[PDB]
């Protein structure tokens, strides 16, 4: 189940600061 995030953005919000 992942229609858009399902809560995974808790990791992608940190990665968004690592990449340009």
């Amino acid at each position: 189940w992942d229609p858009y995030f399902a809560g995974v953005k808790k990791l992608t919000k940190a990665i968004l600061a690592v990449r340009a």
Side-chain angles (χ1 to χ4, degrees):
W1 167 73
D2 175 16
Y4 48 82
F5 279 122
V8 177
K9 56 177 297 182
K10 67 186 164 179
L11 175 62
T12 89
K13 178 175 179 180
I15 292 165
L16 177 63
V18 173
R19 66 177 181 85

Short mmCIF file of all heavy atoms in Angstrom, two decimals:
data_model
loop_
_atom_site.label_atom_id
_atom_site.label_comp_id
_atom_site.label_asym_id
_atom_site.label_seq_id
_atom_site.Cartn_x
_atom_site.Cartn_y
_atom_site.Cartn_z
N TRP A 1 0.82 -1.22 0.00
CA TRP A 1 0.00 0.00 0.00
C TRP A 1 0.85 1.27 0.00
O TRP A 1 1.48 1.59 1.00
CB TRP A 1 -1.02 0.00 1.14
CG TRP A 1 -1.68 1.31 1.42
CD1 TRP A 1 -2.62 1.89 0.64
CD2 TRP A 1 -1.43 2.26 2.51
NE1 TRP A 1 -2.98 3.10 1.18
CE2 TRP A 1 -2.28 3.38 2.34
CE3 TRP A 1 -0.58 2.27 3.63
CZ2 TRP A 1 -2.29 4.46 3.22
CZ3 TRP A 1 -0.59 3.35 4.53
CH2 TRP A 1 -1.44 4.44 4.33
N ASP A 2 0.86 1.98 -1.13
CA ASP A 2 1.60 3.22 -1.28
C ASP A 2 1.00 4.10 -2.39
O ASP A 2 1.55 4.17 -3.48
CB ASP A 2 3.09 2.93 -1.52
CG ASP A 2 3.91 4.18 -1.80
OD1 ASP A 2 3.41 5.29 -1.52
OD2 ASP A 2 5.04 4.02 -2.31
N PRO A 3 -0.13 4.76 -2.11
CA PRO A 3 -0.84 5.59 -3.07
C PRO A 3 -0.09 6.89 -3.37
O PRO A 3 -0.31 7.51 -4.40
CB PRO A 3 -2.19 5.87 -2.42
CG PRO A 3 -1.88 5.83 -0.92
CD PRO A 3 -0.83 4.73 -0.84
N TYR A 4 0.80 7.31 -2.46
CA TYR A 4 1.64 8.49 -2.64
C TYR A 4 2.84 8.54 -1.70
O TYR A 4 3.92 8.97 -2.10
CB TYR A 4 0.80 9.77 -2.51
CG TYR A 4 -0.09 9.79 -1.29
CD1 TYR A 4 0.45 10.16 -0.05
CD2 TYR A 4 -1.44 9.43 -1.39
CE1 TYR A 4 -0.35 10.14 1.10
CE2 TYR A 4 -2.25 9.42 -0.24
CZ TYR A 4 -1.71 9.78 1.01
OH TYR A 4 -2.49 9.76 2.12
N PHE A 5 2.64 8.10 -0.46
CA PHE A 5 3.68 7.99 0.55
C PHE A 5 3.50 6.90 1.60
O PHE A 5 4.47 6.26 1.98
CB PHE A 5 3.97 9.33 1.23
CG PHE A 5 4.88 10.27 0.47
CD1 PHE A 5 4.43 11.55 0.12
CD2 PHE A 5 6.18 9.86 0.14
CE1 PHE A 5 5.30 12.44 -0.52
CE2 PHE A 5 7.05 10.75 -0.51
CZ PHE A 5 6.61 12.04 -0.82
N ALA A 6 2.27 6.69 2.08
CA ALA A 6 1.98 5.73 3.14
C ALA A 6 2.87 5.92 4.37
O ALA A 6 3.03 4.99 5.17
CB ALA A 6 2.07 4.31 2.60
N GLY A 7 3.44 7.12 4.55
CA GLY A 7 4.29 7.40 5.69
C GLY A 7 5.79 7.36 5.37
O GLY A 7 6.60 7.69 6.23
N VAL A 8 6.17 6.95 4.16
CA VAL A 8 7.57 6.81 3.77
C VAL A 8 8.28 8.17 3.69
O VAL A 8 9.50 8.22 3.74
CB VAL A 8 7.64 6.08 2.42
CG1 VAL A 8 9.07 5.96 1.90
CG2 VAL A 8 7.07 4.67 2.56
N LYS A 9 7.54 9.27 3.57
CA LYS A 9 8.16 10.59 3.44
C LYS A 9 8.95 10.98 4.69
O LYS A 9 9.66 11.98 4.68
CB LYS A 9 7.13 11.67 3.08
CG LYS A 9 5.98 11.71 4.08
CD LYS A 9 4.99 12.84 3.76
CE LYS A 9 5.67 14.21 3.85
NZ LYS A 9 4.70 15.30 3.59
N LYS A 10 8.84 10.21 5.78
CA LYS A 10 9.65 10.44 6.97
C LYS A 10 11.13 10.19 6.66
O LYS A 10 12.00 10.69 7.37
CB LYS A 10 9.17 9.54 8.11
CG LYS A 10 9.43 8.06 7.81
CD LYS A 10 8.79 7.22 8.92
CE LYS A 10 8.69 5.78 8.43
NZ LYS A 10 8.10 4.90 9.46
N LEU A 11 11.40 9.42 5.61
CA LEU A 11 12.76 9.16 5.15
C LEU A 11 13.10 10.08 3.98
O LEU A 11 14.21 10.60 3.91
CB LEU A 11 12.87 7.68 4.75
CG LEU A 11 14.23 7.34 4.14
CD1 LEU A 11 15.36 7.57 5.15
CD2 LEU A 11 14.24 5.87 3.73
N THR A 12 12.15 10.29 3.07
CA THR A 12 12.38 11.15 1.91
C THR A 12 12.55 12.63 2.25
O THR A 12 13.19 13.36 1.48
CB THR A 12 11.36 10.93 0.79
OG1 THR A 12 10.24 11.77 0.99
CG2 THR A 12 10.88 9.48 0.72
N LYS A 13 12.01 13.09 3.38
CA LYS A 13 12.19 14.46 3.83
C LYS A 13 13.63 14.70 4.28
O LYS A 13 14.14 15.81 4.15
CB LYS A 13 11.20 14.75 4.96
CG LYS A 13 11.36 16.17 5.50
CD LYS A 13 10.28 16.45 6.54
CE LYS A 13 10.45 17.87 7.09
NZ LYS A 13 9.42 18.17 8.11
N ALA A 14 14.29 13.66 4.79
CA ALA A 14 15.69 13.76 5.18
C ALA A 14 16.59 13.66 3.95
O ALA A 14 17.59 14.36 3.87
CB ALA A 14 16.02 12.63 6.16
N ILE A 15 16.23 12.80 3.00
CA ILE A 15 16.99 12.63 1.77
C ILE A 15 16.90 13.89 0.92
O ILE A 15 17.84 14.21 0.18
CB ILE A 15 16.46 11.40 1.01
CG1 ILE A 15 16.79 10.13 1.80
CG2 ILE A 15 17.05 11.32 -0.40
CD1 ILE A 15 15.99 8.93 1.30
N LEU A 16 15.78 14.62 1.02
CA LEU A 16 15.57 15.86 0.28
C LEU A 16 16.59 16.93 0.68
O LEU A 16 16.85 17.85 -0.08
CB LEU A 16 14.13 16.32 0.53
CG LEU A 16 13.78 17.65 -0.14
CD1 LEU A 16 13.88 17.54 -1.66
CD2 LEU A 16 12.34 18.01 0.23
N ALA A 17 17.16 16.80 1.89
CA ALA A 17 18.18 17.72 2.37
C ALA A 17 19.58 17.24 1.98
O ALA A 17 20.52 18.03 1.97
CB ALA A 17 18.07 17.83 3.88
N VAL A 18 19.73 15.95 1.66
CA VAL A 18 21.02 15.37 1.30
C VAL A 18 21.34 15.67 -0.16
O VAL A 18 22.48 16.00 -0.48
CB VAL A 18 20.99 13.86 1.54
CG1 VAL A 18 22.25 13.19 1.02
CG2 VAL A 18 20.86 13.58 3.04
N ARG A 19 20.34 15.55 -1.05
CA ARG A 19 20.54 15.79 -2.47
C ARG A 19 20.29 17.26 -2.81
O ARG A 19 19.62 17.98 -2.07
CB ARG A 19 19.68 14.85 -3.30
CG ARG A 19 18.19 15.13 -3.11
CD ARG A 19 17.39 14.20 -4.02
NE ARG A 19 15.94 14.43 -3.89
CZ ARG A 19 15.26 15.36 -4.57
NH1 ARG A 19 15.88 16.19 -5.41
NH2 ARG A 19 13.95 15.46 -4.41
N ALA A 20 20.83 17.69 -3.96
CA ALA A 20 20.66 19.04 -4.46
C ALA A 20 19.24 19.26 -4.98
O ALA A 20 18.52 18.31 -5.25
CB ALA A 20 21.70 19.27 -5.55
#
